[PDB]
Ligand binder design. Structure first.
Ligand code: U1C
Lengths: 883, 141, 107
């Protein structure tokens, strides 16, 4: 009942830039393997404990912000269920730790080597400490995103990443078929140790602020070309099918003999006898057909894309010959390339624009057949393993490799042209604490622009909203610099854009209500003559400095506190009279940023669209909570996520007349949900949620739910416990409609009832009095919130019913201790409807881990260490397991 | 000086307005009824920070005193004499919190601080800026 | 009873004997995750004797089977700990206790 408080630690995470995933193909070793070696660990450097876990994580949901979080704060690999870790004797997933059996279980003591293995064929993660296997694995976790190694630590540990050799030497032999994590390096980028989803980075002259990162999806490695299935290949194009083939064949043969290739039986550069030096009609059968289909696809790309070609000339083609070649092209057996004349024609700039698209398509088609055969990308080239470092489809390939594909495509296009035939996470908003609102005087703060992009700086009202971009409402006066604009309610241009480094001096003046923005020493001018950005501003509650860095953008806010540090203060602003926003402050101004973590908040009483009404229970109906869409006519309509503001914990196991001897001793509890007629049941989900549900999806379904399975067994198989962990237990409303009724709009309301047994953890659902065949099992000490996910298609959408059944102890008996044995439905004012909000404000810690987790690429692996302690005073809310 | 010569005479303003309307000079393209677009006024507005820089923030206390003295159609000589008669009213560096960083900025980055002691130069550098600030007020009003 | 586990190994041959002062650093918590009392926040160890209990009896069983620095997780059941009388403002009547104990005794 009372808000708790305690002293907790600061926990961070460090990951390498290695991402793996499961998709249609092109990124599939199926298995990966890496190790973490512990050098030294102080167990009790501080009062609470020392935190150190290793494991894997997901790139779409794992985002531990420093400070509070789920439970008692200090979130690392483990909590939030998007990561799977192992401390030294526990398998951390979801939020609860499950002990595991090991030969000599102990915490991560110094000189300990823990090896984690990831398998994507069957989704499973396994760990091995000091060679001995750990009798516990994860299973059946959804592969929506990419997987990367991660280690979580807090103030006192020192570990090393032994990835794959040449980036950290191994200590134990990996299981067969497992890559040593040193592939998938994405040769456009190098290897690094970086934090996960940071919003503040130390810089040369202060803390830089960082916007959302540009993360990679798991559907990026799969190559998809344009559709060329329906290509007629008319006779004029069909005739030039082989005619083009040997031209590229001989040109590639001479490009191969550039390094000195010769005709022979076995391909080895040291042996120098790769068979590649015959004519097209004399090529070996295996690759012949592949060459024909590639040469044809070269034409099918043009045909499918458009650019209707035509036979401009034929007489010139009949007289074209083969250019002379020196004796260097001659090789011992006797082969000689026959390159067609190429200088007789020149491609127009349109052809130079369109040639690279054909190379883009060709590389995708080339990769497609390779992944169809069973080839996957690998940093280390291995021909017997059916790999080479070129399966990245187009967009993440090194520019050194990119030139060969477009060279070959350009030669093919110029061969066609020579033979006649002419050819035709949204925004990270930074702010200041609301106690710094200014209602008098003149102020001046700067904002360096390290990178050029969508970044906005200005003055905003203290009641600024985080889910709306700056300038869309009357609560902000910012200056966009990507193109040059002033944003109060529109996008009127206000000068010139920035460059790589451009301090913007924003000054407000509340004496005559003006706002002026300056570039590096120059006052910005609007279109005609204004010399000021905004005038006659109605001063109300106050103004605060603001910043709106976009995705992949870095800025630097200098409010003040150091007049000498202000680069362009003396030039413009000082003489007119402008006190910097922080002058007589011995402590830096605390900033507040919009944290993109969806949390549940009560429905506002003045919501534009949704409305919740409480109705008392009559003699026939129980107390109810109705939801109505008050603007169903011509307004917004989108999915929404709701649950009731109170939970119910599961106890530890270690006519219509109700008779007392069963109702007063039962442990079942009931609540029902009624779907009004007209709202499609296929868009309604009814069930329960754990206090760690943070999915604000727009295409939600039962297949996008988070799930995992932890299996415990002895030292060979014989599993004992198989617990299924999730954060959403509901049943789709589209499974309770008869096939005959499906196909139109019905007129009978659908009622779904959910029963929870707090003594055995059994979960059942009934629809219209009919028991369903789906059930769930939960664990002791589990908090569940009655949740309904609905997509509105009506102005009468959904209605919660705190009903009752035959001695089933209505729901208002477990959430309240006073009414423990009261068999009467109730709805106290504390029990309300809470909706899911996309983003919310948050506080930036005054002092982060100032040691910055000192890491370096040492010879014996990548070492990361933390040394200084850090503590904060948490505030735990009991009903919702937050901190 | 040219600005105050223009201000303390009606014929100068009349002739400038007549010249502008007769030649139809834009008077806005140079700076990239139409008093706010006047050439002299814009030039003085651009050059005013030069004059403000040479004045110490301590002279801000005597700025209003000089303005009040000039409010009675006073001359430069009598204003300078009156200022020198009570040149001890400036200062209050320790009496206010907003003056500490101003003095620090004045002392730190620039070069020589006017030899740090020149009673004769103080009134000379205060009178001109006070007259300019006074004459600038009527243009906006 | 007690369900003593292992977190950090000790010596295995220096078990406490009768009439000896045991020095421990312990952190207590109920069987729901809410910590109720700890000794490290007070920056002082806890001293108690065998045969002069002055402590809950389950804590005594847990500290009995330790060896010079063995970190353990003791689980104390009702009728082994404070029991039905509970503690005003402190552990509720029917609840079990989990202690993270470290026997750093120097004799
Ligand atoms: O990936 C391989 C495969 N291979 N050897 C097998 C062959 C046979 C013909 C080609 C071949 C390569 C490139 C182009 N081109 O540039 O249009 C056209 C044909 O490869 C080899 O040495 N690298």
């Amino acid at each position: 009942l009372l808000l708790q408080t305690n002293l907790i630690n600061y926990v961070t995470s460090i990951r390498p830039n290695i991402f793996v995933g499961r998709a249609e193909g092109s990124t599939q070793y199926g298995k990966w393997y890496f190790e973490v070696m512990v050098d030294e660990v102080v167990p009790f450097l501080t009062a609470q404990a020392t935190h150190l876990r290793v494991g894997w994580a997901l790139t779409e949901g794992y985002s531990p912000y420093p400070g509070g979080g789920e439970g008692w704060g200090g979130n690392g690999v483990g909590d939030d269920l998007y990561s799977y870790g192992f401390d030294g004797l526990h398998l951390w997933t979801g939020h609860v730790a499950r002990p595991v059996t090991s030969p000599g279980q102990h915490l991560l003591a110094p000189e300990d080597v823990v090896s984690c293995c990831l398998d994507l064929s069957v989704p499973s993660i396994s760990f091995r400490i000091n060679g001995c296997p750990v009798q516990g694995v994860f299973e059946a976790f959804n592969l929506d995103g990419l997987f990367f190694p991660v280690v979580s630590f807090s103030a006192g540990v020192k570990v090393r990443f032994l990835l794959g050799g040449r980036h950290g030497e191994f200590k134990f032999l990996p299981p067969p078929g497992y890559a040593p994590c040193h592939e998938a390096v994405l040769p456009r980028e190098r290897l690094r140790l970086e934090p996960i989803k940071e919003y503040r980075r130390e810089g040369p002259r202060g803390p830089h602020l960082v916007g959302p990162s540009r993360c990679l999806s798991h559907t990026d490695f799969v190559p998809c070309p344009v559709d060329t299935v329906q290509i007629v290949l008319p006779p004029h194009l069909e005739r030039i099918r082989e005619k083009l083939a040997e031209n590229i064949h001989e040109l590639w043969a001479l490009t191969r003999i550039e390094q000195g290739w010769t005709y022979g039986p076995v391909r080895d550069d040291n042996k120098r006898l790769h068979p590649c030096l015959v004519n097209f009609h004399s090529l070996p059968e295996p690759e012949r057909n592949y060459n024909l289909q590639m040469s044809g696809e070269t034409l099918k790309t043009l045909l499918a894309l458009g650019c209707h070609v035509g036979m401009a000339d034929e007489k010139a083609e009949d007289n074209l010959k083969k250019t002379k070649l020196p004796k260097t092209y001659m090789m011992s057996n006797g082969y000689k390339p026959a390159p067609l004349d190429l200088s007789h024609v020149r491609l127009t700039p349109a052809q130079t624009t369109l040639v690279d698209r054909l190379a883009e398509n060709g590389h995708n088609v080339w990769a497609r057949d390779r992944v169809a055969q069973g080839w996957s990308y690998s940093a280390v080239q291995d021909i017997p393993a059916r790999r080479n470092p070129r399966l990245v489809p187009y967009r993440l390939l090194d520019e050194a490799t990119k030139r060969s594909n477009r060279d070959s495509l350009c030669q093919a296009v110029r061969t066609l042209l020579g033979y006649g035939y002419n050819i035709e996470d949204r925004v990270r908003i930074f702010r200041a604490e609301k106690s710094y609102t200014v209602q008098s005087g003149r102020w001046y703060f700067e904002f360096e622009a390290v990178t050029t992009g969508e970044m906005r700086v200005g003055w905003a009202r203290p009641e600024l909203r985080p889910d709306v971009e700056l300038g869309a409402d009357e609560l902000a006066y910012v200056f966009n610099g990507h193109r040059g604009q002033r944003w109060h309610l529109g996008s009127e241009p206000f000068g010139r854009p920035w460059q790589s480094g451009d301090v913007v001096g924003c000054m407000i003046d509340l004496t005559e209500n003006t706002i002026i923005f300056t570039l590096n020493g120059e006052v910005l001018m609007s279109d005609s003559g204004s010399e000021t950005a905004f005038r006659e501003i109605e001063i109300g509650d106050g103004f605060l400095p603001v910043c709106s860095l976009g995705p992949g953008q870095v800025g630097h806010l200098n409010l003040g506190q150091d007049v000498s540090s202000l680069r362009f203060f003396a030039i413009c602003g000082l003489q007119e009279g402008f006190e910097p926003f922080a002058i007589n402050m011995q402590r830096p101004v605390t900033t507040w940023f919009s944290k993109s973590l969806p949390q549940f908040e009560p429905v506002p009483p003045e919501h534009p669209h949704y409305e919740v009404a409480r109705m008392d229970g009559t003699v026939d109906t129980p107390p109810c909570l109705r939801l109505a869409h008050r603007t169903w006519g011509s307004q917004n309509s989108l999915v929404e996520m709701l649950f009731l503001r109170l939970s119910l914990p599961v106890q530890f196991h270690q006519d219509n007349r109700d008779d007392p001897e069963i109702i007063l001793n039962t442990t079942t509890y009931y609540y029902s949900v009624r779907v009004f007629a007209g709202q499609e049941p296929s868009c309604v989900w009814v069930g329960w949620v754990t206090p760690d549900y943070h999915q604000h999806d727009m295409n939600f379904d039962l297949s996008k739910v988070r799930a995992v399975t932890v299996t415990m067994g002895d030292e060979q198989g014989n599993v004992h416990s198989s617990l299924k962990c999730s954060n959403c237990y509901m049943v789709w409303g589209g499974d309770f409609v008869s096939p005959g009724q499906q196909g139109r709009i019905s007129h009978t309301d659908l009622v779904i009832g959910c029963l929870v047994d707090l003594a055995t953890g059994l979960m059942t659902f009934t629809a219209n009095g009919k028991e369903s065949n789906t059930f769930f099992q939960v664990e002791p000490n589990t908090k569940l919130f009655p949740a309904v996910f609905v997509l509105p298609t009506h102005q009468n959408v959904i209605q919660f019913e705190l009903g009752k059944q035959k001695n089933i102890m209505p729901l208002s008996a477990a959430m309240f201790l006073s009414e423990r044995k009261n068999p009467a439905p109730q709805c106290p004012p504390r029990l309300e409807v809470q909706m899911l909000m996309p983003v919310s404000w948050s506080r930036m810690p005054n002092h982060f881990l100032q040691v910055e987790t000192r890491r370096a690429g040492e010879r014996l692996g990548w070492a990361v260490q933390c040394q200084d302690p850090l503590t904060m005073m948490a505030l735990h809310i009991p009903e919702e397991n937050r901190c | 000086e040219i600005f105050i010569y223009w201000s303390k005479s009606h014929n100068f303003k009349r002739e400038e307005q007549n010249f502008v309307v007769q030649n139809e000079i834009n008077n806005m393209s140079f700076l990239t009824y139409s008093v706010q677009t006047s050439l002299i006024v814009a030039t003085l507005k651009k050059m005013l920070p030069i004059g403000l820089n040479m004045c110490a923030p301590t002279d801000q206390d005597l700025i209003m005193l000089a303005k009040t003295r000039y409010a009675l159609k006073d001359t430069d000589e009598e204003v300078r004499e009156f200022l020198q008669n009570n040149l001890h009213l400036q200062g209050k560096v320790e009496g206010s919190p907003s003056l500490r960083w101003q003095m620090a900025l004045y002392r730190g980055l620039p070069g020589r601080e006017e030899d740090a002691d020149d009673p004769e130069k103080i009134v000379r550098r205060v009178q001109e800026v006070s007259a300019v600030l006074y004459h600038l007020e009527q243009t906006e009003h | 009873g007690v369900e003593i586990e292992t977190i950090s190994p000790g010596d295995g041959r220096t078990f406490p004997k009768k009439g000896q002062t045991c020095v421990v650093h312990y952190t207590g918590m109920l069987q729901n995750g809410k910590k109720f009392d700890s000794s490290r926040d007070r920056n002082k160890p806890f001293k108690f004797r065998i045969g002069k209990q002055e402590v809950i009896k389950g804590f005594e069983e847990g500290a009995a089977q330790m060896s010079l620095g063995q970190r353990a997780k003791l689980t104390c059941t009702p009728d082994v700990a404070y029991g039905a009388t509970g503690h005003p403002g402190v552990i509720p009547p029917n609840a079990t206790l989990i202690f993270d104990v470290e026997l750093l005794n120097l004799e």
